[PDB]
Amino acid sequence: KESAAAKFERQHMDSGSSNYCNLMMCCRKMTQGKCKPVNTFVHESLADVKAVCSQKKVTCKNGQTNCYQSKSTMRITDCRETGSSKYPNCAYKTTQVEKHIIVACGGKPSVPVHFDASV
Ligand SMILES: O=c1ccn([C@@H]2O[C@H](CO)[C@@H](OP(=O)(O)O)[C@H]2O)c(=O)[nH]1
Ligand SMILES: Nc1ncnc2c1ncn2[C@H]1O[C@H](CO)[C@@H](O)[C@H]1O
């Protein structure tokens, strides 16, 4: 069983083309069983992302208060399923932007365990 922190790294970290999401959603296993409809990859170092856990506290979309917002914008890519997408033939629109990220943090040490939003 993969931990929440490991799942966060696999689905969201790509510390670092229109086919980017199509390749990544597949390699990171977000197209098995169903096409994950929306996902965000963060291109900052794992250290910079883990640091968000000690940055600005904000409320989580689900109501929890263990969420934090990055102090700076970060380079991210949003992958969104296209209308033509249909499992097992998933298809994604890739959009790069620079925005702040909001993540839920948990564990000891407190590390990201869920990508909540970009803002
Ligand atoms: O900007 C956003 C907002 C939400 N999500 C994702 O959308 C899914 C539904 O909220 C969540 O993934 P999960 O199914 O693993 O919990 C969350 O990570 C993103 O990737 N980016
Ligand atoms: N605010 C949140 N805090 C922690 N985990 C969350 C939150 N929203 C969704 N999740 C989920 O993401 C985790 C993925 O490992 C699940 O364990 C479940 O907690």
Swiss-Prot record:
Substrate binds at K7, R10, K36, P37, V38, N39, T40, K61, R80. Keywords: Allosteric enzyme, Disulfide bond, Endonuclease, Hydrolase, Lyase, Nuclease, Secreted, Signal. GO terms for molecular function: identical protein binding; lyase activity; nucleic acid binding; ribonuclease A activity; RNA nuclease activity. It catalyses: an [RNA] containing cytidine + H2O = an [RNA]-3'-cytidine-3'-phosphate + a 5'-hydroxy-ribonucleotide-3'-[RNA]; an [RNA] containing uridine + H2O = an [RNA]-3'-uridine-3'-phosphate + a 5'-hydroxy-ribonucleotide-3'-[RNA]. Progressive deamidation of Asn-62 transforms the homodimer (beta- 2) into and heterodimer (alpha-beta) and finally a doubly deamidated dimer (alpha-2). The lineage of its organism: Eukaryota, Metazoa, Chordata, Craniata, Vertebrata. Belongs to the pancreatic ribonuclease family. One of its GO terms (biological process) is defense response to Gram-positive bacterium. It is an enzyme of class 4 (lyase). This enzyme hydrolyzes both single- and double-stranded RNA. Its main location: secreted. This is Seminal ribonuclease. It comes from the Eukaryota. One of its GO terms (cellular component) is extracellular region. It is found in: Secreted.
